[PDB]
């Protein structure tokens, strides 16, 4: 209805939103393709606006994966956004703007992927996230907390904690990577000091959980630090 | 006076944040004005600017207040306020904002371009003027979401030294070690954290995990299994259990300890499956474990509930078809290793399990375009991704040797041994295209190259012993065969050379006897050893 609407329709850029999320949810193909279609475009508000689909496209992806359009749309972007990522790490005994008394890559370089293998996914679903990580500033409390109760329903899945939270549907376990549930904790940790307290909280426990059972140690990690500074 | 004087305006006013601004701006002055040649309102004015511009929700005046008080050059008196702002800032910049609205200090809304530069900075600072807990998690945070976690094993190393044995930095240091990959020093500290809390089983399954690596110590490994022994992490502990014993076994010296500790491997696998059928690792382990003890349609049964479990999983597939070729289905075996590498494209261990079994149902060409493949993915994904390149020369060579092309062979071995000049892999290589060339004097010292730097590589002492069987020299060959026994008691063609030897010296019931053995294990041998899919947590 209003998602037609929607399809047929800079000023462009300047009731949808959830309707385009009942399509996402329901199992679609035109709107994954004017959401592809959007991030091609330079104009950084349709970026924004496809990256608030972003995690709800993933948690569908991975949802039918455990039980073709999404997949594409999801490899899409990602051939779009890959570039080296880099930091250098400040020294003390250099005079800063701060006071007075080497580059680092953290991501990069992705290759580009023609199709959606089980190795390379997690590549480029963790590059992703980063990507949504980057502009997370932007991103309405919605997506916020569509973040929160999709990591907490990736982490807990196939676990006997599902069943704890409630989650009905699919109970299979999804693998994950470790960097994965790192860009998840950067996200919730954001969504912690933005309004979305309690979902960032069973959000985080559910990160904990997994990496306790996954035996992943920079997740369990940086996520330790998380509530550890929690007030 | 005149900051007093301005901060006192901004009271009595209570535009506020304008007097506040100044009247902290005017004490700075002030205050390295007097170290060239404490405040009530000094103190308000300082600090009530940024206070009032959270309060009224303007992330950005207050950011560039904390920038303009701590772009002030040093005073000492301005120090912890300079720390207390700097720590704030930090978390302001790692908690409320990301990359994409990050601008520079002294850009309008070492100069950091990036937050996680600012930010670590700050931390930094505020750590440095703390000498003589929470800038620590902070540092934590913003070192893990970038990956930096030697530097975190040094910051959290730095932390030790004030801290008593407290649970959370020592677990969080212990942590940092093992995603920095210093292993044994987190094994330490992880040994000290199951010391300071019992509760958490995670912290002896992580040291089990480390110990079953790369740093191989299995006892230790044991050892932490055991102190694991919630249903989920019982598993977990069974599982580790097992994979211990496991490995314990392949490492035993004599037929009963490998024996023994295979079973107990089967039992705590067997446990851990069932404790948590959903788990597909403990499915997954128990039909490997059962591959190894040759029992194929039990292992082909969990097999496949494993890949129920878990469809994609790159180890099980390849289980499948090392199962399948043990069946001598070659064909079978080669479509699921082609599946599996559908879905995983670069890895090697796949590959080299298809050039076999090409090499066994295909033909040599096949598995020669195979190499070359493997080659090329080799050339394209660049320690030791090295001993891959060998092995893909070396699989090319064993192709030409298979053939009958000692040429090409000792080409392929050549590029192996620019390499590895003295890998037992291309010593014995020598060998094998020293017995195709008929030279089998040469082929013999090169066997026994291999054994020197290889003591176990049973395939060199298969080899070696069937020459000094040929030569005549029956007790020596039978000693060897005796020894290579010993470190594969399923090696059939070991079987083979001892019943000829045995059967030469007119032992003929032993003989017989061996070549039973023989025939009943090549029965169920699959194209590549099953130990060749890692054993790890």
């Known amino acids: 209805g209003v998602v037609e609407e929607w399809l047929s329709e800079p000023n462009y850029a300047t009731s949808l939103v959830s309707s385009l999320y009942k399509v996402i949810q329901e199992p679609l193909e035109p709107v994954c393709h004017q959401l592809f279609e959007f991030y091609r475009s330079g104009e950084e508000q349709l970026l924004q606006f496809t990256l608030q689909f972003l995690p709800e496209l993933i948690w569908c992806y991975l949802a039918v994966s455990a039980s073709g359009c999404i997949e594409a749309l999801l490899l899409g972007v990602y051939n779009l956004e890959i570039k080296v990522l880099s930091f250098t790490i400040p020294s003390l005994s250099k005079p800063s703007v701060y006071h007075e008394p080497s580059k680092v890559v953290y991501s990069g370089p992705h290759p580009q992927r023609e199709m959606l293998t089980a190795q390379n996914r997690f590549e480029v679903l963790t590059f992703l996230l980063l990507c949504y990580n980057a502009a997370l500033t932007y991103m309405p409390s919605v997506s916020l907390q569509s973040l929160c109760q999709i990591c907490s329903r990736i982490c807990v899945c196939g676990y006997p904690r599902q069943h704890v939270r409630k989650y009905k549907g699919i109970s299979s376990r999804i693998p994950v990577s470790s960097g994965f549930m790192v860009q998840m904790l950067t996200g919730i940790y954001f969504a912690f000091y933005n309004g979305e307290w309690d979902l960032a909280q069973k959000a985080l426990d559910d990160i904990i959980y997994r990496a306790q059972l996954e035996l992943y140690p920079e997740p369990l990690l940086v996520a330790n630090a998380i509530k550890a500074s929690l007030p | 006076v005149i900051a007093e004087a301005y901060a006192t305006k901004g009271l009595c006013l209570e535009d506020v944040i304008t007097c506040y601004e100044k009247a902290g701006d005017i004490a700075l002055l002030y205050l390295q004005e007097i170290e060239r040649v404490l405040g009530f309102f000094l ?8 206070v009032l511009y959270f309060k009224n929700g303007n ?11 701590l772009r002030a050059v040093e005073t000492r008196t301005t120090q912890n306020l300079r720390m207390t702002i700097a720590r704030q800032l930090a978390e302001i ?17 070492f100069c950091p371009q990036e937050n996680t530069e600012e930010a670590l900075l700050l931390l930094l600072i505020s750590e440095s003027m703390a000498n003589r807990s ?33 649970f959370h930095l020592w677990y969080q240091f212990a942590l940092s070690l093992m995603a920095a990959g210093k292993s044994a020093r987190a094994v330490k500290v992880l040994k000290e954290c199951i010391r ?23 006892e230790e490994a044991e050892k932490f299994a055991k102190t694991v022994v919630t249903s989920e992490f019982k598993a977990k502990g069974y599982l580790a ?14 037929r009963g300890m490998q024996e023994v500790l295979q079973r107990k491997a089967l039992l705590a696998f067997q446990r851990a499956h069932s404790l948590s059928p959903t788990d597909h690792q403990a499915a997954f382990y128990l039909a490997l474990q059962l591959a190894i003890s040759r029992q194929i349609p039990e292992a082909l049964g969990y097999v496949r509930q494993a890949l129920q479990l878990q469809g994609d999983d790159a180890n099980s597939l390849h289980l499948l078809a090392l199962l399948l070729s043990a069946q001598k289905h070659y064909h079978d075996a080669l479509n699921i290793i082609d599946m599996a590498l559908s879905e995983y494209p670069e890895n090697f261990i796949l590959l080299f399990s298809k050039v076999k079994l090409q090499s066994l149902c295909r033909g040599p060409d096949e598995a020669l375009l195979t190499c070359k493949h493997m080659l090329q993915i080799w050339k394209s994904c660049y320690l030791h991704p090295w001993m891959t390149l060998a092995q893909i020369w070396l699989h090319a060579a064993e192709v030409y040797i298979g053939i009958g092309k000692p040429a ?16 037992h892999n291309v010593l014995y290589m020598r060998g094998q295209i020293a017995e195709l060339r008929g030279s089998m004097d040469e082929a013999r010292r090169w066997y026994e190259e291999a054994l020197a730097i290889s003591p176990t590589h049973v395939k060199s002492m298969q080899r070696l012993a069937l020459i000094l069987h040929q030569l005549g020299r029956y007790s020596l060959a039978e000693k060897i065969l005796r020894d290579a026994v010993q470190v594969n008691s399923t090696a059939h063609e070991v079987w083979n050379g001892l019943g000829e030897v045995l059967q030469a010296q007119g032992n003929d019931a032993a003989a017989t006897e061996c070549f039973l053995t023989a ?11 099953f130990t060749i899919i890692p054993r790890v947590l």
């Open chain 2, 519 to 529: 025939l009943e294990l090549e029965a169920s041998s699959p194209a590549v050893p």
């Open chain 2, 43 to 50: 103190e308000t004015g300082l600090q009530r600017a940024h």
């Open chain 2, 93 to 109: 910049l790692l908690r409320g904002m990301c990359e994409q609205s990050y601008w520079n200090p002294l850009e309008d809304p």
């Open chain 2, 59 to 69: 992330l950005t005046r207050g950011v560039g207040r904390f920038r303009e008080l």
């Open chain 2, 196 to 218: 300071l809390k019992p509760d958490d089983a995670t912290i002896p399954l992580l040291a089990a995990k480390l110990c079953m690596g790369s740093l191989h110590w299995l």
């Open chain 2, 241 to 254: 259990l097992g994979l211990t014993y496991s490995l314990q076994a392949t490492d035993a010296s004599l």
């Open chain 2, 408 to 423: 090409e062979a000792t080409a392929c071995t050549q590029e192996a041994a620019n390499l590895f000049p003295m890998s």
């Open chain 2, 134 to 166: 929470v800038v620590y998690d902070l540092l934590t945070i913003a070192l893990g979401r970038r990956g930096q976690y030697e530097m975190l094993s040094e910051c959290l190393e730095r932390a030790m030294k004030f801290a008593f044995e407290e």
